[PDB]
Amino acid sequence: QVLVPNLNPTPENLEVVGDGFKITSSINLVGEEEADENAVNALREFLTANNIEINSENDPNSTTLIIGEVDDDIPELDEALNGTTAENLKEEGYALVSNDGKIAIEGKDGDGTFYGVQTFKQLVKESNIPEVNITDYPTVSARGIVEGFYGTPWTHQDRLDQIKFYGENKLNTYIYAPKDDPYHREKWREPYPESEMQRMQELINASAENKVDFVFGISPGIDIRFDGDAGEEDFNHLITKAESLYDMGVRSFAIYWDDIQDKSAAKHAQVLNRFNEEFVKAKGDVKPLITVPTEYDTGAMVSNGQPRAYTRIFAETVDPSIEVMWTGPGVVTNEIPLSDAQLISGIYNRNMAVWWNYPVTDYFKGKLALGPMHGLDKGLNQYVDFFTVNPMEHAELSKISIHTAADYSWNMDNYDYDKAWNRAIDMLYGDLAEDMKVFANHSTRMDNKTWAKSGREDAPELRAKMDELWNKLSSKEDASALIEELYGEFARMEEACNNLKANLPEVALEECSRQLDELITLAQGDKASLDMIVAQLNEDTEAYESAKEIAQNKLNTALSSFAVISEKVAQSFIQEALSFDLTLI
Ligand SMILES: CC(=O)N[C@H]1/C(=N/OC(=O)Nc2ccccc2)O[C@H](CO)[C@@H](O)[C@@H]1O
Numbered sequence: 001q002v003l004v005p006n007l008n009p010t011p012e013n014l015e016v017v018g019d020g021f022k023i024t025s026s027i028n029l030v031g032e033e034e035a036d037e038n039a040v041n042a043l044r045e046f047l048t049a050n051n052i053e054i055n056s057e058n059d060p061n062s063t064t065l066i067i068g069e070v071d072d073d074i075p076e077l078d079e080a081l082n083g084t085t086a087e088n089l090k091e092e093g094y095a096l097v098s099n100d101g102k103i104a105i106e107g108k109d110g111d112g113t114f115y116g117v118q119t120f121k122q123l124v125k126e127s128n129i130p131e132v133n134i135t136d137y138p139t140v141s142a143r144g145i146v147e148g149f150y151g152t153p154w155t156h157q158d159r160l161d162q163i164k165f166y167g168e169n170k171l172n173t174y175i176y177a178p179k180d181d182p183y184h185r186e187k188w189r190e191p192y193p194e195s196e197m198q199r200m201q202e203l204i205n206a207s208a209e210n211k212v213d214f215v216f217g218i219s220p221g222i223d224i225r226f227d228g229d230a231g232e233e234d235f236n237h238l239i240t241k242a243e244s245l246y247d248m249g250v251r252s253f254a255i256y257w258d259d260i261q262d263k264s265a266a267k268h269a270q271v272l273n274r275f276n277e278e279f280v281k282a283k284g285d286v287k288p289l290i291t292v293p294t295e296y297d298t299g300a301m302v303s304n305g306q307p308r309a310y311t312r313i314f315a316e317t318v319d320p321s322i323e324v325m326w327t328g329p330g331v332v333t334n335e336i337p338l339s340d341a342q343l344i345s346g347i348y349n350r351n352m353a354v355w356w357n358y359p360v361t362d363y364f365k366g367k368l369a370l371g372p373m374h375g376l377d378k379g380l381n382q383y384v385d386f387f388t389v390n391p392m393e394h395a396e397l398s399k400i401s402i403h404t405a406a407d408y409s410w411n412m413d414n415y416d417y418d419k420a421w422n423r424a425i426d427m428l429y430g431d432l433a434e435d436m437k438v439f440a441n442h443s444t445r446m447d448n449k450t451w452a453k454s455g456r457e458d459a460p461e462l463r464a465k466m467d468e469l470w471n472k473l474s475s476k477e478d479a480s481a482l483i484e485e486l487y488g489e490f491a492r493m494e495e496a497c498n499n500l501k502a503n504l505p506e507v508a509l510e511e512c513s514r515q516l517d518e519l520i521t522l523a524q525g526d527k528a529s530l531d532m533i534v535a536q537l538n539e540d541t542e543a544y545e546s547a548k549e550i551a552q553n554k555l556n557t558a559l560s561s562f563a564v565i566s567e568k569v570a571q572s573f574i575q576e577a578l579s580f581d582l583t584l585i
Contacts, residue, residue, distance in 0.1 A: 001128030006427050008169050008403060009410035010121060010420075011136040018131030021101055021123065023063045026053035029523040031067035032049025034439045036110035038209055039117045042065065042167070047341065066104045069113055080104035084133055086112055092172070092211075093137030098118065098226055108137070109466060114211045115170050122222050139412035142172025142386040145402060148256075150362040153178035153191045156199050158395040160206050165399060167210030169406040173388060174207060175254060175290070177217030185219040189237045191244050204249045214251040215285060216245045221260035221294075226267040226481050235274060242279055246286070253280075254290040263294050266315035273319050273558040280321075290386075291318070292325040298340055299330050307347050315348050323386055325353040332357045332452035335375035341383035353386035358455055359401040361388040364448040366564035368397055368515055370403035371456040372421035378412050394511040400424045400440060417456060432503055438496035439512075442519055442566035462489060466573050473533070473582065483530055492528070493523035493570070514563035521561075525554025529577035536582035551577060 004021040032040055043065075047054065055062055068074045070087045086095040086108040093108040105120060107113030116457035119136065123129055144166060147154060152160065163174060179185055183192050192200060205216035218241060222325075225234045242253055257268050272291055281285045293314045295301040301311040309536065312329065326344050328336040336354070345352045356376070359369030369392060380387075387409040391398035403424035408415045421444075422437070429436040444456040457463065464488060470480040499518045501513065509516075528551035535543035556575040564573075 001130060001426070004130045004132065005122060005125050006423050007119065007122045008423060008427060009138075009407040009416075010414055011134045012411060013133075013135045015133050016130060016436045017097075017133050017175055018099055020128060020130045021063075021098075023052065023103075023127045023129055024061075025051075025127075025480075026055050026062055028058055028062050028064040029054050029067070031065065031072070031074055034072050034074065035067045035069065036107065036113040038211060039067065039107070039110065039113035041209070042114060043117045043120070046117070046124075049126075049204055050124070051129070063102070064102045066102070067113065067117070067224050068105070069107045069109060077104055077106055083108060084135065086135070088137060089137045091534050092170075093135070094119070096123075096132070096134040098123070099133075099397065100130050103129065111172070111211050112137075114167070118168055118170060121168070126402065130534065138170070138410045139381045140385055140387050140409045142173050142213075142353070142414070143409040144171040144175070146175035146177055146217075146388040146390050147529045148175065148177045148179065148217070148258075148355065148390045149360045149393060150179045151365065153181050154393070154395050156202070160205055162201070163206040163210050163212055165402070166212050166406075169403060170410055171335060171406050172212050173215065174212050175215040175217055175388060176203070177215075177219070177254060177256060177335075180221075184209075184217065185222065188218055188220050188224075189234075189241065191241060197248070201246070201248050209248070214250060215254050215287075215290060216242070216250045217254035217256055217290075218242070219256040219258070220271075221257050221262060224271070225262045226264070226271065230399075232336075235271065238271075238275060239279060242275075246283065251285060251448045252287040252290070254292075254457065256292045257293045258296050260294060265293070265310045266317055267315050268293065269317035272322055276319050276322060287321075288321055288323050290323045290325065290353065296325065296355070297329065297331050297333075298344060299328045301326065301344065305343070309348065310558050311328060318348075320350060322454070323353045324348050324350070325355040325386075325388075327355050327357055330451065331450075332360075332363065332446065332455055333375070336377055336380060337378050338377045338382065341377070341380055345383035351385040352383055354380075354384055356387070356389045356405075357390065357396055357443070357452075358446065359392050361392045361394075361446065363452050364446060364564075365393075366515075367560050368392065368394065368443050368512055368565075369402050369446050370397060370440035372417040372424070373415070374410040374417050374456040375454065376408060378415055381412055396508045397511045399428055403428065421456070432500065435496040435499045435503075438493060439500055439516065439519060442493070442570060443515065445568065447567065457568065458566050462570050465489070466569070466576070470576065473580070483534065487527065487530055488550065490526040493526075494520050497523070514561070515565050518561055518563040518565050521554050521557050522566060522574075525551050525558070525574045526570055528554060529574050532577055533580070533582060539583070548578065 020365035066077045066080045080102045081104045083097050086093050086106045090106045092111040093110035096116050096137045097104045105116035113480040225231050274287045277408040280289050295311045329340050361369050389405045407420045425436050426433045441459050445458045446455045447453045469482050497516050528547050
């Protein structure tokens with residue numbers, strides 16, 4: 001339409017060049033047989049879904065859609081593009097032009113054509129398409145998800161849905177590494193049963209269809225042996241287990257050393273160099289080997305600007321072709337400043353991979369991590385060419401944070417976490433988006449009270465309003481308009497939560513029903529907290545006492561519950577109100 005819809009990720013260069021036009025009921029398609037197979041299917045599926053027919057002939061002044069790669073000799077495309085091209089973009093880059101009853105998609109390579117089609121899909125709203133000239137390409141070459149958490153692994157259905165979801169948002173990496181799949185870690189030696197294999201084949205296939213590298217991770221750390229013939233048999237077990245997966249089409253692999261006791265850096269890396277030599281190089285079509293060392297956060301890797309002993313030997317031993325992940329300054333931390341990547345990258349003498357622990361909640365499962373990528377430097381691409389997030393065991397609600405990770409890593413320099421976060425929920429939740437924002441807003445900051453802290457603060461604007469209320473009140477100023485405003489906010493929280501319980505799809509609701517009820521409880525305690533303030537100002541001892549018992553119950557209910565939400569806002573406000581003695585004349 002006239003207006004450009006929400007797009008994700010944010011295209012590098014987009015310009016509106018006209019008024020927009022309505023695509024016709026059937027269209028002329030050019031380039032099908034010569035253009036990327038996966039791109040065309042995704043194009044077909046979108047056409048089928050939106051009841052847009054294809055002409056088996058051509059003209060009747062129907063909309064023309066031209067699709068192809070720069071390398072193809074396609075004149076209609078050249079003409080339809082009219083000077084703009086993907087010729088000089090990086091891999092996965094594309095050019096899209098919609099003008100005057102024509103849409104032209106040109107990829108730099110097949111991946112770029114597929115991605116062009118995803119942008120086309122996001123651009124079309126009720127047959128209306130804006131008129132734009134786009135050139136697009138990612139900041140970072142590897143973008144995706146590592147299923148690396150503890151707890152119930154994603155179901156097969158979950159994974160397939162996730163893969164399609166990655167393709168649509170232009171993420172190209174899925175690392176299969178769940179800690180509590182025994183065939184990955186606890187029984188890392190034994191092959192998959194001849195039906196978990198069938199499920200593997202589907203994962204592999206779906207990833208191919210969506211331009212996602214399926215990375216198979218193995219974590220031998222617990223009981224692997226290195227010395228003598230034990231070490232040899234155990235090494236062989238890696239190869240046979242990897243080949244078993246290569247044989248069905250796995251062309252990316254990871255060997256992980258995270259959270260084991262064994263700190264033998266030379267042993268770990270020689271296993272990696274052995275595998276890199278006798279497996280990766282020998283096969284010729286396997287991507288760079290990926291790893292994570294026993295020391296994987298800056299606190300664990302570094303001492304006063306220098307590598308620790310393990311890190312030193314690992315860095316100096318591991319092959320330059322091997323991609324090394326780290327998590328940042330801590331395992332779950334506020335930030336990765338440019339200076340942290342510079343440091344670690346300097347130690348390994350290369351571009352690093354990030355294993356980012358958000359939205360993962362395995363260490364603190366009562367809270368859902370529902371905020372955007374936050375704290376990650378917008379120039380990280382200077383030292384990082386591989387960005388993954390470790391998600392929650394809750395596949396569906398992970399989409400929100402994943403959605404924003406896709407924008408951060410594709411278009412890093414323009415990344416706006418607030419805008420990305422709003423876009424994620426808008427694009428995911430539709431009619432329910434405004435209610436979903438109210439609830440998810442209260443559930444962004446992860447904090448286990450000890451080693452793990454990350455994410456945008458919960459409900460900052462509400463927090464600022466609460467702060468404003470206390471200083472108006474402790475200054476003896478009129479806070480009545482603010483009090484009234486805060487009543488509106490607490491009522492609004494409870495009503496959003498109720499609309500969500502009533503209207504969310506079950507697949508999302510089964511993941512958040514407890515945290516929903518908890519924000520309701522909290523909102524009701526916040527309401528009772530204002531009642532306390534008002535009764536005090538009014539010198540009504542009775543109304544105060546009654547409100548205090550309610551507020552105190554709601555807080556106690558919240559504190560005892562499994563579910564955790566809004567600790568520093570909705571919850572703490574009640575503690576603040578209980579402790580504020582407004583009657584001291
Ligand atoms: C590379 C990485 O972060 N590995 C694991 C990881 N490892 O950190 C720890 O092992 N932390 C820890 C160790 C002992 C006791 C308590 C926490 O942290 C993530 C967040 O929970 C897990 O999901 C990851 O699988």
